[PDB]
Design a protein around this ligand. Structure first.
Ligand code: CLA
Ligand code: CLA
Ligand code: CLA
Ligand code: CLA
Ligand code: CLA
Ligand code: CLA
Ligand code: CLA
Ligand code: LMG
Ligand code: LHG
Ligand code: BCR
Ligand code: BCR
Lengths: 132, 146, 131, 80, 743, 164
């Protein structure tokens, strides 16, 4: 289900084969030309499409472009060398910009930025003021 | 006709199959080079590589060195080459230690500690000997005249 | 699917100045520091791809890929808890002639697929499951 | 890697989560603001340190603060 | 109907002063009003970016056409002023009588505050600043003779300036052409290549054949300017012309018949330089323009317009495709007919490249009477045109990048040459990086090697013509080819195109005009350094164009724009990653490149060409031939060039050359001043401003337009600007002061 | 059968040209040898022609243009060391060529391995290949003609188009 592309010297390297790799998938209603983050132009297929990239940002950048084409069914995965796959985005099925009941707060401090502790107070502690 | 295609038919790998990258000439040359040739033992691989690199290195030193115009210029050139070979050998030793570690098992895989050590040894012998051969050859140059 | 495969990495968070393993782990379990190319008929990066007659470009031979079928499974597994919360709330709001959570899930996902199910409010779900 | 913290001064404008280039931020339910939503940083392991989020915050002083820290392949944006 | 027609909208924009009183009207954002000092700076930086001011190509196009008329008006006023100043504030008449002794001057300073010292005793009972633009020589070649004529050409210039300004107003406010009119490349090229250039050359040839040639012959012979017949007299009395050139007697009869040979009297292929004036023979120049005219007029009939015959550029471009280049040149026509930035890129690069060529060809083959012996003018012109060229070339690259970020559309460019280039960008940049390193290490290494050797008392180990030698064999060969060409490969010619390749020494007034320039080891070393500098400049600029839209580091650079400060402190640091920043860095390297080139010219000429020759054969060059053994080491350049040739500026105080000394110092100051903008950051300055504002507030007063520090991008721009001004300014004074003395 | 498959080499002026029928009973291997020989002999001829022309013209900027303009005299003047390098170098390439030939899928004459990207289905490819062959065939005859002129007639320059 690979989109039609002729190849580039800006594709993935060894890290994709020995450390980690990424993959995005989407469905289209027409064959159209899009610009790939790696560099160049490609033609998507009329239906399912799969593409591999080396960075999550590269994948999410393409998603932005896809939204312009009115495609909002994209999914991003991380494939480890052993074959293990992790579903990353949309994580809970709902885009992050939309509040979804069932998501808990993380890394939240209940005070204004100016209420953090003084650096000297936490000296020889190992923690930082913003983590204190 | 398109003479440039995606490498290995993977449109997303960062490489292309150009005439330079994948031509019968390039494939043939690289396949038979000592580094990638099939069947050569680690020692022999190093030996061939060393023999090749030592012979051409004596030239630069002998003809352009500080004592080039001296009667002992060629001798000095030889010594200089040996010095350079030693430096390069140190590098090979150090690389192996860092890249491969301290104890190995696979064996006969240029990419293991034991194999690398053997490879390094071959390089040293070949390089130094090759430089010596050049010394003997450059001692008397033939005019090939009848 | 081992949902902790990524978390199970060699990374050890430091005391101060580190976000941590986050949600999906901070680093790959595998070490990128592998060797270089090898002679014909030999392998280097463990489960590497044989370069055949072109060992010099072996790293360009892909061996890591995503199975579309397998892709479905990873989607379901990583989103299992979310689905659970969703159905639970639907159950709490006095479902019409409710049966079993799982049963309801199957019925509700039989229609509206699964992705649509994950993106629907309990109200919409109840409207959908009115029948 | 990097540390992102959200403070009580948030107003749930969602602008930050719409600017992250690597999906590190999310909008979670909350009651301290009229919007009834607050931002969270569930996946800081993918923060590159761009600080685009901070540039988008409308509060007097950023309600979202990014403190750069330990660097990994992901945080250093290395595709190689 | 007709493919090519004229479409114009009447009364498009009302003329009023309302918008004038509403600064920032062009922009939606700026129009709201000033709230901080940034608004002021932004107003000036977005003034001529029409693409951001409107979304319609027609509107953008209309503005550009009118704006161009404005530039033309300014240029005309400039030329007019020069001629006027040459009519009322010059010593042209005296110089005309004795060109060898009197010094050219066309600017006079008022007697205020001792500035009068700047009025030098140039000659001809006149005191003024010695100009170096070469106006006098040009006027002599045209056959001006009088100062009344200069006055009239000045009046014509003023009139022309006004006409252009009216045209600008008319074609923007009263009769604005529509987009369809602008998009007619074939017609434009036919007209510009046959009318602007072809007819232009032919007209000039007419002036040269009927007015300039005859007058200049009389001048050279010795006839006093006052005794030479007025220009109109030559045009009317054919007999007078027949006396000088004995072929006008036959009339135009030979021309209509095929006997063009009879006109050999005034149309010639002599080559070389006139012995008396030291300039190219005007007869040859006349044939030159006549020949070029024919060529251009013929070329203007290549593209289709409204009569079927001709070529359509689109078809030509699309047909040229090959096995290694996919769809080939498909898609380029649309780009160049729908993007002003793309057009500017190509046009600007070529224009700059031409200027550099003019500099080289205009010294080797002096084109004006009494120009070569005027070393000051020669040096000034070479350096001036070398600079103009460098800036333009870098500018072309900049606008090329703006295209990629603003006008490039993936859909219209599939598998075309552009697409394929952006698909192997890594390979291109990687290889160029290596080429730059190779050249740089080897080329500059030669100099460092030599310095070390000479310092260690080992002169026999240097790369010199007296030791290990690196001779420019290829160039030496071409020189011989060109020297022996006359009479062989160029049978009808009579002499070398330039005496630089080889020949005798042409001297005018006891001073050497041209002499064979030889190439040795030093020349090899310097030429290869030029290659290194140019190559590095290309690397920075090309990288900017290729990686303008995206990169592995920032995959979405396009959305950020062409001129963004950075993406953030993340990814290890993303400072200066925009295409604008690549142009910023490229200009610094262009400065270096051009500086070395101009220095090469100055030392080589003053050492191996310029000088004096005795009645017998004794050549004394200005510096004495030091270039061969001194330019092979860096210490040599610092001592035998900069330190020694700067004795003039530093010792100019108390003389008419005092201005150069002051400017030399002032330029150094500005150069250093810039380093504070290039090394510092906005943060420190903003905080400092806060404290300063505290003081004003403490006294119950503060500006509503809150004072803010300059933007990151502006900081860099201000720094580069001052850096360039200072550096170029310093050399300007150095060269001019030295030249005045050597002349 | 080679005759039933060959496409390159058969052109318009004469079509298949084997008046003496020297390929009637030959097998594919022999025919392959012939084609390879034809191409090699022709390609070398083309190169030789260019070399002769340049030397004769006088553009021999080597050894301070010491060697004679006559190509055949120059060869005698060349030191043997120069000739040895030539033969040995060509020999090396010949070895590599043998390696390529052994590899499966070898098309007689292809050392760049263009078979990897293009096949004879493409008319452009076959046509360009024909141009090489046709020019090579002509060059072979020419080099033989020129030598005759230089050795017997006594001239080593164009005696055909020289008269403007
Ligand atoms: C004198 C000051 C100076 C020097 C030496 C350099 C040097 C360099 N700049 Mg640079 N630059 C400078 C000022 C300078 N810059 C300034 C002020 C700016 C601001 C505008 C820039 C902006 C700039 C950019 C934007 C770019 C460069 C690039 C380069 C590189 C060109 C490649 C090359 O020739 O490598 C050779 C380097 C040398 C220094 C040659 C001399 C070294 C010796 C003689 C050669 C042999 C030494 C050997 C390798 C090791 C010896 C061992 C022993 C000494 C320990 C090179 C490293 C380009 C680059 O990286 O692309 C390749 C590039 O893109 N520069
Ligand atoms: C490229 C164009 C150019 C340049 C650079 C110069 C430069 C010079 N000219 Mg010259 N000139 C030119 C064109 C030019 N001229 C033309 C086309 C003519 C024909 C009309 C003349 C006629 C001319 C004469 C007749 C004289 C000069 C003189 C001079 C010198 C003194 C200038 C001066 O008046 O200072 C002083 C400047 C002023 C008195 C002007 C006052 C400053 C004004 C008020 C500031 C501008 C106000 C501002 C724009 C308001 C904006 C309002 C808004 C609507 C835009 C100076 C070297 C003089 C000279 O050399 O004497 C020895 C002199 O006598 N020129
Ligand atoms: C006195 C006659 C006159 C008047 C009243 C106007 C009035 C107007 N013009 Mg117009 N124009 C005129 C002459 C005039 N024009 C001429 C002669 C030209 C041809 C060059 C143009 C070309 C032109 C363009 C291309 C555009 C306008 C626009 C406008 C409108 C906005 C005003 C503006 O941008 O402020 C400008 C005020 C200034 C003071 C700018 C002057 C800058 C000077 C000329 C630079 C050179 C100075 C110096 C020599 C260089 C540095 C030293 C306004 C209705 C704009 C508009 O709104 O279009 C919809 C627009 O895009 N005009
Ligand atoms: C044919 C020539 C030409 C033309 C028509 C343009 C036109 C344009 N360029 Mg461009 N450019 C050119 C040549 C040209 N350029 C060259 C040669 C370079 C290389 C230096 C550049 C580099 C360049 C950059 C880097 C950028 C542009 C931009 C632009 C656009 C907006 C310009 C602007 O902001 O106006 C306002 C103009 C100014 C503020 C200039 C004022 C003059 C400043 C203050 C310098 C003055 C120096 C002065 C001579 C020194 C006097 C010393 C004395 C005081 C002692 C516009 C489409 C910008 C853009 O956004 O494009 C879309 C942009 O970012 N160009
Ligand atoms: C190296 C020499 C050489 C060789 C090996 C070939 C081989 C071939 N040619 Mg060929 N050819 C040559 C030179 C050669 N050619 C020259 C110089 C010309 C120009 C006249 C041609 C013109 C030509 C045409 C027009 C055609 C061929 C074809 C063929 C192929 C089928 C015919 C055949 O079997 O010929 C067998 C040939 C040989 C086994 C060797 C040739 C016999 C040798 C040279 C004996 C020497 C005879 C000669 C008179 C020597 C004196 C030369 C000079 C002193 C006058 C075959 C592969 C046909 C083809 O491509 O079909 C697929 C075809 O249509 N050839
Ligand atoms: C491996 C690198 C290498 C090196 C260092 C040389 C070096 C040389 N070649 Mg050489 N050559 C090479 C590769 C090389 N070649 C290759 C690959 C070929 C093609 C097979 C040739 C073909 C060749 C010819 C045909 C000639 C040389 C000649 C020469 C010599 C120049 C003249 C001379 O002796 O001045 C000191 C010089 C010793 C010339 C020579 O020795 O004539 C005197 C000569 O005529 N070479
Ligand atoms: C493809 C056709 C062809 C070929 C292969 C040659 C080949 C040759 N020509 Mg020739 N020539 C040709 C067409 C050709 N010519 C035409 C069409 C004309 C008329 C313009 C000439 C006019 C011509 C002259 C006037 C001379 C040559 C000479 C030469 C010889 C020197 C090579 C050189 O550099 O030439 C150049 C070389 C054998 C030169 C020669 O014979 O040197 C002894 C020589 O003086 N040619
Ligand atoms: C060699 C055996 C006999 C040598 C002899 O008799 O000396 C006798 C000769 C003495 O030759 C000397 O040369 C000098 C320079 O010209 C002097 O001018 C005199 O000619 C002379 O006294 O030794 C040699 O020069 C030839 C020996 C060459 C050795 C060949 C290289 C072998 C590899 C060397 C590298 C060893 C390092 C690791 C090896 C793996
Ligand atoms: C340079 C030799 C040359 O011109 O080859 C030209 C070569 C072949 O061009 P084509 O004939 O196939 O394409 C024709 C069209 O581009 C229009 O001419 O193009 C390349 O692939 C250049 C490769 C990068 C250049 C390597 C450095
Ligand atoms: C350009 C080119 C090429 C290449 C070339 C080259 C690169 C060459 C090189 C070469 C070389 C580089 C060679 C080498 C050689 C070496 C040798 C020959 C050695 C020897 C040695 C020996 C023989 C021995 C020694 C010893 C030892 C081992 C030890 C003990 C002692 C002794 C002494 C015994 C060719 C032509 C292909 C083709 C075209 C391209
Ligand atoms: C310096 C200057 C200027 C200029 C002036 C002038 C340039 C004057 C002149 C004018 C003129 C004086 C012009 C003229 C022209 C002429 C012509 C252009 C001619 C043409 C020709 C023709 C058109 C012909 C045709 C024909 C033929 C081809 C043959 C047959 C017959 C007939 C008739 C058909 C001004 C002031 C502006 C400004 C300042 C600077």
């Amino acid at each position: 289900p690979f989109p039609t592309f002729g190849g580039s010297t800006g594709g993935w390297l060894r890290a994709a084969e020995v450390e980690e790799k990424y993959a995005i998938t989407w469905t289209s209603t027409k064959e159209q030309i899009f610009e790939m983050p790696t560099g160049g132009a490609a033609i998507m297929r009329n239906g399912e499409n799969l593409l591999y990239l080396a960075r999550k940002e590269q994948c999410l950048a393409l998603s932005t472009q896809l939204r312009t084409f009115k495609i909002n069914d994209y999914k991003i995965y991380r494939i480890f060398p052993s074959g293990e796959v992790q579903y990353l985005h949309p994580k809970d099925g709902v885009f992050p910009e939309k509040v979804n009941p069932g998501r808990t707060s993380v890394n939240s401090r209940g005070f204004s930025i100016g209420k953090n502790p003084n650096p000297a107070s936490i000296k020889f502690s190992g923690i930082t003021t913003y983590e204190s | 006709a398109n003479f440039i295609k995606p490498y290995n038919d993977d449109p997303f790998v960062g490489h292309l199959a150009t005439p330079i990258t994948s031509s019968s000439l390039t494939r043939a040359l690289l396949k038979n080079l000592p580094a990638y040739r099939f069947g050569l033992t680690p020692l022999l691989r190093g030996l061939e590589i060393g023999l090749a690199h030592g012979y051409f290195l004596i030239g630069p030193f002998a003809q352009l060195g500080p004592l080039r115009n001296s009667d002992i210029g060629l001798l000095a050139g030889f010594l200089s080459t040996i010095g350079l070979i030693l430096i390069l050998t140190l590098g090979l030793t150090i690389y192996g230690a860092a890249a491969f570690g301290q104890e190995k098992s696979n064996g006969s895989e240029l990419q293991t500690k034991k194999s690398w050590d053997q490879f390094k040894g071959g390089f040293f012998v070949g390089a130094c000997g090759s430089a010596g051969f050049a010394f003997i050859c450059l001692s008397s140059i033939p005019t090939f005249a009848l | 699917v081992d949902l902790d495969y990524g978390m199970k990495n060699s990374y050890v968070p430091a005391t101060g100045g580190d976000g941590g393993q986050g949600q999906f782990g901070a680093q790959s379990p595998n070490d990128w520091r592998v060797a270089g190319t090898s002679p014909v008929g030999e392998t280097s990066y463990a489960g590497a791809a044989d370069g055949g007659e072109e060992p010099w470009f072996a790293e360009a031979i892909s061996t890591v890929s995503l199975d579309l079928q397998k892709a479905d499974e990873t989607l379901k597994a990583f989103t299992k808890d979310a689905a659970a919360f969703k159905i639970e709330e639907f159950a709490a709001e006095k479902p019409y002639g409710f049966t079993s959570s799982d049963a309801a899930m199957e019925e509700l996902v039989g229609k509206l697929g699964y992705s649509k199910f994950l993106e629907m409010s309990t109200k919409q779900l109840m409207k959908t499951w009115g029948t | 890697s990097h540390t992102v913290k959200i403070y009580d001064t948030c107003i749930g404008c969602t602008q930050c989560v719409r600017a992250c280039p690597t999906d590190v931020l999310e909008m979670v339910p909350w009651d301290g603001c009229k919007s009834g939503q607050i931002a969270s940083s569930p996946r800081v392991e993918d923060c590159v340190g761009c600080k685009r989020c901070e540039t988008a915050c409308p509060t007097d002083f950023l309600s979202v603060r990014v403190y750069l820290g330990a660097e990994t392949t992901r945080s250093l944006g290395l595709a190689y | 109907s007709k493919n090519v027609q004229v479409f114009v909208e009447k009364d498009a924009v009302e003329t009023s002063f309302a918008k004038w009183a509403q600064p920032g009207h062009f922009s939606r954002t700026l129009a709201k009003g000033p709230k901080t000092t940034t608004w002021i700076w932004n107003l000036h930086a977005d003034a001529h970016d029409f693409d951001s001011q409107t979304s319609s190509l027609e509107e953008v196009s209309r503005k550009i056409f009118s704006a161009h008329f404005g530039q033309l008006a300014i240029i005309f006023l400039w030329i007019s002023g020069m001629h006027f100043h040459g009519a009322y504030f010059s010593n042209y008449s005296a110089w005309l009588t004795d060109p060898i002794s009197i010094k050219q001057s066309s600017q006079v300073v008022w007697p205020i505050v001792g500035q009068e010292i700047l009025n030098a005793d140039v000659g001809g009972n006149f005191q003024g600043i010695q100009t170096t633009s070469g106006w006098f020589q040009m006027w002599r070649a045209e056959g001006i003779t009088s100062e009344v004529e200069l006055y009239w050409t000045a009046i014509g210039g003023l009139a022309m300036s006004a006409i252009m300004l009216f045209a600008g107003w008319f074609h923007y406010h009263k009769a604005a052409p529509k987009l369809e009119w602008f998009q007619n490349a074939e017609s434009m090229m036919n007209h510009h290549l046959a009318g602007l250039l072809g007819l232009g050359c032919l007209s000039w040839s007419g002036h040269q054949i009927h007015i300039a040639l005859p007058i200049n012959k009389l001048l050279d012979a010795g006839v006093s300017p006052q005794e030479i017949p007025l220009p109109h007299e030559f045009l009317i009395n054919r007999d007078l012309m027949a006396q000088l050139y004995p072929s006008f007697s036959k009339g135009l009869a030979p021309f209509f018949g095929g006997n063009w040979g009879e006109y050999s009297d005034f149309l010639t292929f002599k080559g070389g330089l006139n012995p008396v004036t030291g300039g190219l023979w005007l007869s040859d120049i006349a044939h030159h323009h006549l020949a070029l005219s024919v060529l251009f007029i013929i070329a203007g009939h290549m593209y289709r317009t409204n009569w079927g015959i001709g070529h359509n550029m689109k078809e030509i471009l699309e047909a040229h495709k090959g096995p290694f280049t996919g769809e080939g040149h498909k898609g380029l026509y649309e780009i160049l007919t729908t993007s002003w930035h793309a057009q500017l890129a190509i046009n600007l690069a070529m224009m700059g490249s031409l200027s550099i060529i003019v500099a080289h060809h205009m010294y080797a083959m002096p084109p004006y009477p009494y120009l070569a012996t005027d070393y000051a003018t020669q040096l000034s012109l070479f350096t001036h045109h070398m600079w103009i060229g460098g800036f333009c070339v870098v500018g072309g690259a900049a606008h090329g990048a703006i295209f990629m970020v603003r006008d490039y559309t993936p859909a219209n460019n599939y598998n075309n040459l552009l697409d394929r280039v952006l698909r192997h960008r890594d390979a291109i940049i990687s290889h160029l990086n290596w080429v730059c390193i190779f050249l740089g290490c080897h080329a500059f290494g030669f100099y460092i090697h030599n310095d070390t050797m000479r310092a260690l008392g080992r002169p026999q180990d240097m790369f010199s013509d007296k030791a290990i030698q690196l001779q420019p064999i290829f160039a030496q060969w071409i020189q011989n080819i060109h020297l022996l060409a006359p009479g062989t490969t160029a049978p009808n010619a009579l002499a070398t195109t330039s005496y630089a390749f080889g020949g005798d020494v042409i001297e005018v007034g006891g001073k050497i005009a041209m002499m064979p320039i030889k190439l040795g080891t030093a020349d090899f070393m310097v030429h290869h350094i030029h290659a290194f500098t140019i190559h590095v400049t290309v690397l920075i600029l090309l990288k900017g164009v290729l990686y303008a839209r995206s990169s592995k580091l920032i995959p979405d650079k396009a959305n950020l724009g062409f001129r963004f400060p950075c993406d953030g402190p993340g990814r290890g640091g993303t400072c200066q990653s925009s295409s604008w920043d690549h142009v910023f860095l490229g200009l610094f390297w262009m400065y270096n490149s051009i500086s070395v080139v101009i220095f090469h010219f100055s030392w080589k000429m003053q050492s191996d060409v310029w000088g004096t020759i005795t009645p017998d054969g004794a050549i004394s060059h200005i510096t004495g031939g030091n270039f061969a053994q001194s330019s092979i080491t860096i210490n040599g350049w610092l001592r035998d060039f900069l330190w020694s040739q700067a004795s003039q500026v530093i010792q100019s105080y108390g003389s008419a050359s005092s201005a150069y000394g002051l400017i030399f110092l002032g330029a150094h100051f500005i150069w250093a001043f810039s380093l504070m903008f290039l090394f510092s950051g906005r943060g420190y300055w903003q905080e400092l401003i806060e404290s300063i504002v505290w003081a004003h507030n403490k006294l119950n007063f503060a500006p509503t337009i809150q004072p803010r520090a300059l933007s990151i991008t502006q900081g860099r721009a201000v720094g580069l600007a001052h850096y360039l001004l200072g550096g170029i300014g310093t050399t300007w004074a150095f060269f001019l002061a030295r030249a005045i003395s050597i002349t | 059968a080679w005759r039933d498959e060959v496409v390159v080499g058969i052109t318009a002026p004469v079509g298949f040209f084997d008046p003496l029928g020297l390929s009637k009973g030959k097998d594919d291997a022999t025919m392959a040898y012939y084609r390879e020989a034809e191409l090699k002999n022709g390609r070398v001829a083309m190169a030789a022609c260019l070399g002769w022309y340049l030397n004769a013209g006088g553009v021999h900027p080597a050894f301070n243009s010491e060697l004679s303009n006559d190509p055949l005299k120059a060869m005698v003047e060349l030191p043997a060391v120069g000739w040895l390098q030539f033969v040995l170098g060509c020999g090396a390439i010949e070895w590599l060529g043998q390696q390529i030939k052994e590899r499966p899928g070898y098309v007689p004459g292809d050392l760049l391995g263009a078979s990897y990207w293009v096949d004879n289905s493409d008319e452009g490819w076959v046509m360009y290949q024909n141009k090489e062959l046709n020019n090579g065939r002509l060059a072979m005859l020419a080099i033989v003609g020129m030598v005759y002129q230089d050795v017997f007639v006594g001239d080593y320059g164009d005696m055909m188009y020289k008269q403007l």
